[PDB]
Every structure is written in structure tokens, then in C-alpha cells.
Design a protein around this ligand. Structure first.
Ligand SMILES: [Zn+2]
Ligand SMILES: [Zn+2]
Length: 922
DNA sequence: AGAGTCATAGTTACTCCCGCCGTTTACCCGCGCTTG
DNA sequence: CAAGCGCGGGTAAACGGCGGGAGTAACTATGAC
RNA sequence: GUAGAUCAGCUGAUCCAAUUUCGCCGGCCGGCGAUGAAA
């Protein structure tokens, strides 16, 4: 009987039909569930607004009633008789009376600075005065870009290609210069707002200790000045402080040091026009360093509002996203009105009046010196614009707040405070007895309210205060999410028809199915459900870009996975989806590295030291990250944060996170905090192929060629290194996994050794690779001999000594200042403990005596104790032996960079042996 | 030295019906100011 | 001074929120084969 | 024909290879600056 009219399914019971409707047909059923609005209950915010307006009207007039109140409130949406009826309530007049009563009220430092200024000025003066070819040019550009500022290259490669900007200088100068030039006409703040907000240590001379404690990310690009971070680092700190104090006294920076070159960055990976970029400014390095100190000082001096959780000593994005999710979940669960309006200010930093800013700083309480410095800096400030390579015409800026400066996000925090103080005192959401009203991150404002009139009043208040400040509200992204519960039917419903106005301009009302992004996280009207995870496209982009395999691996390690880490941590992802995603990652990495499909799982994801590829496993890393980030929510200083942490939704999320992490981790011994690194480590060494890698952990330097020194080796040899390191060479034994139904020809050596053909056998024991082994030994001994000579010693390679026992061939003998060392070199299979092999090699040299005295006499020193036994022992997979490492770095002094390279030689020699075997396979 | 699709249970996000008391406001009833 | 209009008390008859109860379509993990 | 090689039908595509362009100091040859995305 019961049959749907859109999916054409007949269900046994009306319950089935309705539940099917709620999923298969969201929009139409949501419209059907819109409640009638005959006699809506009087929410508290309506009562507060009514009482306040009645009180002010009585104070200015003396008498009031519904007739004039209606005129006072045009958009209240209550009938002239409904208002009169509500007027009869006693607590209402009590609040009216309460509000009425409330209304009843050295030469060298200057020399070096001048040298830097002259160099910058000379640079400024100099500056002012086919498909195959396309791909080659792109390769050159990408390599040069990645060599200098990695983040730029990663963002370009993952997102789009072909220059990125793609819009040239035109379409920017025509679209931005007029805005950057126009002077704002903000009248300033009203005295009412100043009073509402009303609810010295700065400028002191900077000291050496504070600047030293002032951290700096030296991995930064220089500005138009041309002063690179290297020389600035080279300057001693005390002279830095001298110049900083000199500037403090002068209250200004040298003219040329303020000039900045504007650059554009896309808000969206696929910009549709010139207006979707952020015209950031890169000031000179010394100016940024100088302003960081004041940024920290002002951060410590006057903290922002409690609701302000942007650029502070806390993860504002996490708290805001969690709070929004908790609010939405609570509203859905108990069917309570909640209007959430996401607000953004287009040209946010580039729309604030200079005069309003400086005067507000004056009234707020900063010292006159600081306000005057800001005013002077922004009065004569000027900028240059340059996209791609175009020193455009310089521009004089009429609106301040310079994106990229350390002070700008803090100075704008004053305006943020002012506007945050303007919303009505009693509008918000009562989330677990806590009133939450606004969630601010930088400029992105999210206003919450429990009533339509309350939300409209809040919107109008923020609009007018911004207009007074000079800011203008964007209608492109601003939207209002509204949920009206349906009591007597227990149905959640969303409004559709637009009803909110920013200064007469209607807003876009987000429907139920729409997806909108907040802080870069996808949000649905029902809460964070999932991320579309366009990972296939990103992997295709990375694979198609002109990069060597290690470049792609590093990008996937450090820039792609973290980017979607936020979407997944703040989203709701089922571990099956995570497994599919990590399988996709594994397949892509196997393609890039040309590995087969039988390589052990753990190899990809085990951390660098344990010998893995350090490619983060989403399936396990994500639960760990969400547990770590949501554990501290209960202990956050913010009261609303603690209230959210007690929400049912977050509790369930954390429970599932704990279960997953418990399943994919082992408790650490020392810190007792579960770690995923241990899980992959255990799996890798237990694997048949990785069994020989069990010694990597004890020697961190054994694997330095995977991540730090990956730039000194070509792509091809890196791929070969990875192939042999995990034993990916398709030998017959390794080629018969599951196909051992054949005869001995399927397992014997081709060369005729008649023994089992193991990759170790091919690399070490087969006679055909005899000369290969010798040349590998010669190469490694030559390298270590050259380095050890470079460490001020004596060299006599392969001393020909005929001892009583017979003919013995030591690797190298050494002698310095009367002390000599007998160093032996050899490579050994990893199937046995490397240190026992080291001891076995050392016994037959250091425990003979007669050869010890022979080498002592040859070197010319009589005492035998000065001669010591040592063995350079490295497994053919390139894994170090701990005891050998220690003795080599301690008994004889060698810097670690030299020791970092021995595994490279061992690995290259082993693969050369393999390829030689295959070459003379005949 | 391998990388199981598939059967079944658990679950989540809903559904709907019935009934309960509390809440809101369209009528109704006047009084005071204005105009004929 | 009387009729009319705007300003004010009262009433009750439906809305509205929530409790209680009885199911299920569409995923999402494994326990075992 | 490709910086080189390879597979195709002088053109295309893949690679384990692939530093483009402008200005300069200079003698087709050497060196320099740009070709730098926030906190
Ligand atoms: Zn249907
Ligand atoms: Zn053999």
C-alpha cells in the first residue's frame, strides 16, 4: 500500500515510507515539514528587546503603549494585539522597570645599517632601471620555486598548475588599484559604542633577552628591500637591539625599509575572477622582525575578548569548529531555534579607515607614542604591486591594516573587540547553561541567536558599527543558517525564503543540502558530515607535475596529507572510507616508486627511523590526531569550550576515536601515551622482507638518506635504493610467491650455483658478483679513507703484511700523535645481529698480537696499546651497526655528515651488483 | 607471503501516534480625548 | 453632550513543547567461514 | 624531428632525463641580479 511518489518504492508501513522520505528526498520533505507560525512562543530575546525599547520610549516620552511601540518596532513580526497581550505579563513589566532604572544613570651599528640600506637601494635602482617547451619551462620554474619556498611550490602543484595566477597584471591593477587608492570616509565610532566598549609598559626599550626569546621563522622570503634572512641572522643581537632602540627613539623606520611588494594568493583553488585573491603585502625582513617584538608585547599587554579566539595562544580553528558542531548537534537533538550567520568582510584587512584606527587606538589606551608611530607609518606608507614578474606602478594606500605584518592581525583585533562589544548583551545560544553569541577568527565572524528578531538586530548592529569603522560587509559569502523546530511534530526544519537584511540588502538563506566551508572545512546544514576528498585529482596533479620521485613523496608526506587532516579531524569519516583513501595513497606511491603490490603494508607508513617511508597512514593517524586535539577540550580556559566538550556528539566522536587508536597502536613504555609509530614499527620488523631492518631504530643516522639528504641523489638511483632497501628485486624465490608448483628450476640460481636462489645469495654469495663485491668494498674503503685522512690522520691502504699465521689483508691502518687505529670494513647479511658480526670481525684482528706489533712497528710506535681494532660494519641494505657507529664516531673523530653517506655507498654498490648480475645473466 | 567478497548484526537517524499541560492572542468590554 | 476612535483590563480555545511508546531504511563494524 | 632516449603516425605521447625567460658585467663562451606566498 504505502508507496513513495519519487523513488517509486512500496513499503510495508508508513513508518518505512517516512523514514525513506527523510533520506532519499531531503529538500521536498524538509519543505513539507515547515511549521505553521500562528502563535509562536515568546522567546526571551524578544522580551528583552521589547522591554528595552519600551523603557527608552518611556524615558524620552513618559508614557507608552502598543500603538506607539508598533511604530517603534517595524519588523518585530507581532500583531498590535499580541504585543498588548504580552504587555500584561508581570515579569515583563519588571524587566521594563529594571531597564528604566539602568537608563536612569654605536657608529659601527649605524655603519652596517647604512651598508644594508645602500645595498638595498642599489638593488632597487637596478630593478627600476611548443608543448614540449612548455613542459620544460614548467619543470625549470617548479624546480627553482621548490628550491626556495617549499610551501608555494606544494600549493601550486597540488592545486592547479601553469603559473597559478593565470590572470596576468591586467585584471588586477584595474580591479585592485582603485580600491587600494580610495580613501575611506568613515565618520568614526559613536560615543555610545565607546561607552559600551568601556565596560604603559609598551614602548619600553627592547632588551637582548626578550629579542633572543623572540622566535623567528627564518625560512622566509625577503621583501622588495632585497635583504635576505641570512645576513639579518648574521647580525649580532646586541647591535640589533641598538638599532631597534634607535628607531624607537626616532619613532620611525628608514623610508626604503617600509616599501612592500604586494602578492596575490587564491582563497579558492580554482579562482573564477581577480576578486578571489588576498592582496598580501611582504614588508622588509628587518621590519617584520622589529614588529614581531611589538606584536608579542601587545599580545601580552591587552588580551582580546573571551569570544575572540583568533590569533592567540590557542587553536582557534579547532575550538570554533567544535563549538559550531556542538551547537548544531544540540539544536538538532532537542529541536531548539538556532540562527547561525556566517559573516565575512570582503577586502577585510583592506577596508579599515586610518583615522578611525588611530583614534580608536588613542581612546583605547595605548600610549601616545605608539599611536603617533602608527599614524606616521600609515600616513607616508606606499606599496608596489607585482604579479609574476611585473614591477607595476607604485600605489599610495588609502586604507590601512597591512596583511602579512606581525602587528596587523593584532591591531585589527581592536576593531574586532569594538564590534564584539556592540552586540546586545542577551543574544546567543544557551548551550549547556552557557550563553554563546559570537565566534570570531580573524575577520570571519559567526553570529548566533535564538530568535529571528534577535538575529536581525545583531546583524544590523554589526553592520552599523562596521560602517562607522569603515568596514563593508560582503554579500557574496554571508549567509544565515536557520532552524525552526516543529513542536507537536518533533520535526527539525530549515527555512528557505530569505528574510535577513544587511542595510536593506537581503541575505542568502542556506538550505538543508547545501555545503558551505568554514575555516576551510566543509559544513552541511545538518553538521559536518563528510569531506568530498578529491584525492584522486590531487594525486593526478602531483604525479603529472615535473618532479623527481622523492619530490612527489615529500610533498605527499608534508603538504597534501596535512591539508585534508583538518577536513577529516573536524569531519565525520568512517574508517572504511579511511581505508579506501589510504589504499589509494598506497597505490599512487607504488606507481611513483615502481614497487610491486606484495610489499609489506607497514613499509609505507613506518616512521623514518624505523626504516619506513614515513607516508602517514590516514586510517591510524587521523584517530590519533582527533584524540589528541579533543582531549584538552575539557581543560580549555574558555567556558563555552568546556560546555561543548560535554556535548553528546563530541563525546561519541571521542569514544570512537579512542577505540580506533586502541586498535591501531601500542602503549609507549616511557610516556605511556599510545603511539602509532610503535604499531608500524612492530609490523615492519615482523614482516618477512623487513626482518633485516630491525637494527635501523637503534641507529638514527642509518636512514638519513630518506628525508634529509634526498636532494643530493637523482630520481633513478633513489628508486633503485627504495627497490632494494625493502627487497623489491624480483628474484625467482621472490617471484614465486603463490606459484611454487614448479620444479627446482623455479628456485635454483641461473648462474649454476645449484643452491637456493635468494636475493641475499645473488648479492653476496654468487660467484658471478665476485668482482662486484670487490669493487663495492674498494669504493667504500676509498671513501672512508679519504674522509679519515681529511680528519688529520695517516693513511696506508691495504698494508701487505705476512704474519706467522699466514696472509692477512687489513683494510686501513692509521696513526696520529702516537695513537693508531686498525679499521676494517665489510658488509654483512642483515639476518643476524650486526654487533655479533662486528665482534667476530674484530676478534681475528685485535686478538692476535703479533700483527698488532707488526703494524705498530710499521707505523713507528712501539707500544701496542696505541693500536686499536675497529670494524666498519654496514648491512647490505644500508643499515648501520650501533656499536660500530659509536666506536667509529668516538675512538676516531669524524663528523656525522660523512657517516650519513656510507649507507648511500653500500646501497648503490649492492644495486650495482644486482644489475651487473642481471646484465651478465646472458 | 597475502592482501576475501559477502552474510549478518549493530547502529543511527530518523519515523509516527497518542496524550499531557502550558502559552498566546483574536474577541469582548470598558474610559479618555476629539469632533460635530 | 453624544458618537467615534485610540487606549487600555479580562476570557478561552485552539497552538506548541514534550513525555511516552512502537518501529525501520540505510549504512558500518565485526565474527566467522 | 626532440636537451636525450623510447613508443607511435615532419606532428603527437611516456620516461629512471629534463633550469625556461629577461637585464647586466663582460669576452657564439664565462660570471652576476631577477625569475621568492602570508603570520
Ligand atoms: Zn521515494
Ligand atoms: Zn647461484
Amino acid at each position: 500500500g504505502w508507496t513513495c511518489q519519487f523513488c517509486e518504492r512500496t513499503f510495508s508501513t508508513n513508518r518505512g515510507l517516512g523514514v525513506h522520505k527523510r533520506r532519499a528526498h531531503p529538500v521536498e520533505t524538509n519543505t513539507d515539514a515547515a511549521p505553521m507560525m500562528v502563535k509562536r512562543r515568546w522567546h526571551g530575546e524578544e522580551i528583552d528587546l521589547l522591554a528595552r525599547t519600551e523603557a527608552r520610549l518611556l524615558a524620552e516620552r513618559g508614557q507608552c503603549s502598543g500603538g506607539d511601540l508598533f511604530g517603534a518596532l517595524p519588523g518585530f513580526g507581532r500583531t498590535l494585539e499580541a504585543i498588548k497581550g504580552q504587555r500584561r505579563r508581570e515579569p515583563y513589566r519588571a524587566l521594563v522597570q529594571a531597564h528604566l532604572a539602568r537608563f536612569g544613570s654605536s657608529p659601527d651599528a649605524a655603519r652596517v645599517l647604512s651598508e644594508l640600506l645602500e645595498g638595498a637601494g642599489r638593488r632597487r635602482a637596478c630593478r627600476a632601471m611548443t608543448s614540449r617547451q612548455k613542459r620544460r619551462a614548467e619543470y625549470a620554474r617548479v624546480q627553482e620555486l621548490y628550491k626556495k619556498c617549499r610551501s608555494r611550490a606544494a600549493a601550486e602543484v597540488i592545486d592547479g598548475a601553469c603559473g597559478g595566477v593565470g590572470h596576468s597584471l591586467e585584471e588586477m591593477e584595474t580591479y585592485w588599484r582603485p580600491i587600494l587608492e580610495r580613501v575611506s570616509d568613515a565618520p568614526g565610532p559613536t560615543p555610545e559604542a565607546l561607552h559600551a566598549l568601556g565596560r604603559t609598559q609598551l614602548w619600553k626599550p627592547i632588551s637582548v633577552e626578550e629579542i633572543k626569546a623572540s622566535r623567528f621563522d627564518w625560512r622566509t622570503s625577503p621583501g622588495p628591500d632585497g635583504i635576505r634572512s641570512g645576513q639579518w641572522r648574521a647580525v649580532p643581537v646586541h647591535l640589533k637591539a641598538e638599532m631597534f632602540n634607535a628607531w624607537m627613539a626616532r619613532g620611525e623606520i628608514p623610508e626604503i625599509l617600509r616599501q612592500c611588494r604586494t602578492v596575490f594568493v587564491p582563497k579558492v583553488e580554482r579562482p573564477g575572477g581577480p576578486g578571489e585573491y588576498r592582496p598580501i603585502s611582504i614588508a622588509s625582513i628587518p621590519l617584520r622582525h622589529f614588529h614581531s617584538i611589538l606584536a608579542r608585547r601587545l599580545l601580552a599587554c591587552c588580551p582580546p575578548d573571551a569570544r575572540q579566539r583568533g590569533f592567540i595562544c590557542a587553536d582557534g580553528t579547532l575550538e570554533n569548529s567544535a563549538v559550531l558542531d556542538a551547537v548544531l548537534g544540540d539544536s538538532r537533538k532537542k529541536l531548539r531555534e538556532c540562527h547561525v550567520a556566517v559573516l565575512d568582510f570582503a577586502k577585510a584587512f583592506d577596508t579599515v579607515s586610518h583615522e578611525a584606527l588611530v583614534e580608536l587606538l588613542r581612546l583605547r589606551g595605548m600610549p601616545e607614542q605608539f599611536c603617533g608611530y602608527i599614524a606616521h607609518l600609515y600616513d607616508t606608507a606606499s606599496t608596489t604591486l607585482a604579479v609574476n614578474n611585473e614591477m607595476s606602478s607604485p600605489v599610495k594606500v588609502g586604507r590601512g591594516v597591512r596583511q602579512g605584518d606581525p602587528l596587523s592581525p593584532i591591531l585589527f583585533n581592536v576593531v574586532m573587540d569594538l564590534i564584539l562589544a556592540s552586540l546586545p548583551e542577551r543574544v546567543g545560544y544557551r548551550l549547556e547553561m552557557e550563553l554563546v553569541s559570537a565566534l570570531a577568527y580573524a575577520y570571519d565572524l559567526v553570529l548566533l541567536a535564538g530568535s529571528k528578531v534577535g538575529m536581525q538586530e545583531s546583524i544590523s548592529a554589526v553592520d552599523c558599527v562596521g560602517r562607522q569603522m569603515g568596514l563593508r560587509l560582503n554579500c557574496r559569502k554571508s549567509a544565515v543558517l536557520s532552524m525552526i523546530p516543529d513542536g507537536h511534530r518533533k520535526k527539525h526544519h530549515y527555512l528557505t525564503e530569505r528574510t535577513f537584511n544587511i542595510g536593506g540588502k537581503p541575505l542568502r538563506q542556506v538550505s538543508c543540502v547545501e555545503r558551505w566551508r568554514y575555516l576551510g572545512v566543509d559544513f552541511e546544514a545538518s553538521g559536518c558530515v563528510t569531506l568530498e576528498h578529491s584525492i584522486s585529482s590531487a594525486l593526478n596533479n602531483i604525479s603529472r607535475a615535473p618532479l623527481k620521485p622523492q619530490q612527489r613523496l615529500e610533498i605527499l608526506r608534508a603538504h597534501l596529507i596535512p591539508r585534508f587532516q583538518h577536513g577529516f579531524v573536524l569531519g565525520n569519516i568512517s574508517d572504511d572510507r579511511l581505508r579506501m583513501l589510504d589504499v589509494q595513497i598506497r597505490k599512487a606511491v607504488g606507481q611513483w616508486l615502481r614497487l610491486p603490490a606484495d610489499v609489506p603494508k607497514a613499509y609505507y607508513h613506518a616512521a623514518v627511523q624505523d626504516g619506513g617511508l614515513a607516508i602517514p597512514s590516514v586510517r591510524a593517524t587521523i584517530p590519533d590526531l582527533i584524540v589528541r586535539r579533543f582531549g584538552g577540550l575539557d581543560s580549555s580556559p574558555w567556558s563555552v569550550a568546556r560546555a561543548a566538550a560535554k556535548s553528546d556528539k563530541i563525546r561519541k566522536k571521542l569514544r570512537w576515536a579512542w577505540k580506533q587508536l586502541r586498535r591501531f597502536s601500542r602503549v609507549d613504555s616511557t610516556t605511556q601515551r599510545p603511539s602509532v609509530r610503535l604499531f608500524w614499527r612492530e609490523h615492519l620488523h615482523a614482516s618477512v622482507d623487513g626482518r633485516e631492518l630491525r637494527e635501523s631504530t637503534r641507529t638514527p643516522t642509518s636512514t638519513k638518506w630518506i628525508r634529509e639528504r634526498c636532494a643530493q641523489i637523482t630520481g633513478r638511483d633513489f628508486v633503485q635504493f627504495v627497490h632494494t632497501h625493502i627487497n623489491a628485486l624480483p628474484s625467482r624465490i621472490r617471484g614465486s610467491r603463490g606459484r611454487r608448483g614448479g620444479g627446482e628450476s623455479s628456485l635454483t640460481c641461473r648462474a649454476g650455483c645449484k643452491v637456493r636462489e635468494t636475493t641475499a645469495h645473488i648479492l653476496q654469495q654468487c660467484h658471478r658478483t665476485h668482482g662486484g663485491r670487490i669493487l663495492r668494498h674498494n669504493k667504500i674503503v676509498s671513501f672512508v679513507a679519504k674522509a679519515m685522512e681529511e680528519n688529520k690522520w695517516t693513511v696506508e691502504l691495504e698494508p701487505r703484511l705476512r704474519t706467522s699465521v699466514g696472509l692477512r689483508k687489513p683494510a686501513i691502518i692509521a696513526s696520529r700523535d702516537g695513537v693508531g687505529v686498525i679499521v676494517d670494513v665489510q658488509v654483512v647479511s642483515g639476518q643476524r645481529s650486526l654487533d655479533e658480526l662486528h665482534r667476530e670481525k674484530r676478534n681475528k684482528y685485535g686478538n692476535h698480537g703479533e700483527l698488532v706489533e707488526l703494524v705498530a712497528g710499521r707505523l713507528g710506535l712501539p707500544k701496542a696499546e696505541c693500536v686499536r681494532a675497529t670494524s666498519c660494519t654496514i648491512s647490505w641494505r644500508g643499515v648501520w651497526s650501533l656499536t660500530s657507529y659509536k666506536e667509529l664516531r668516538s675512538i676516531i673523530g669524524l663528523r656525522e655528515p660523512t657517516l650519513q653517506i656510507v649507507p648511500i655507498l653500500a646501497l648503490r654498490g649492492s644495486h650495482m651488483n644486482w644489475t651487473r648480475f642481471n646484465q651478465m645473466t646472458s
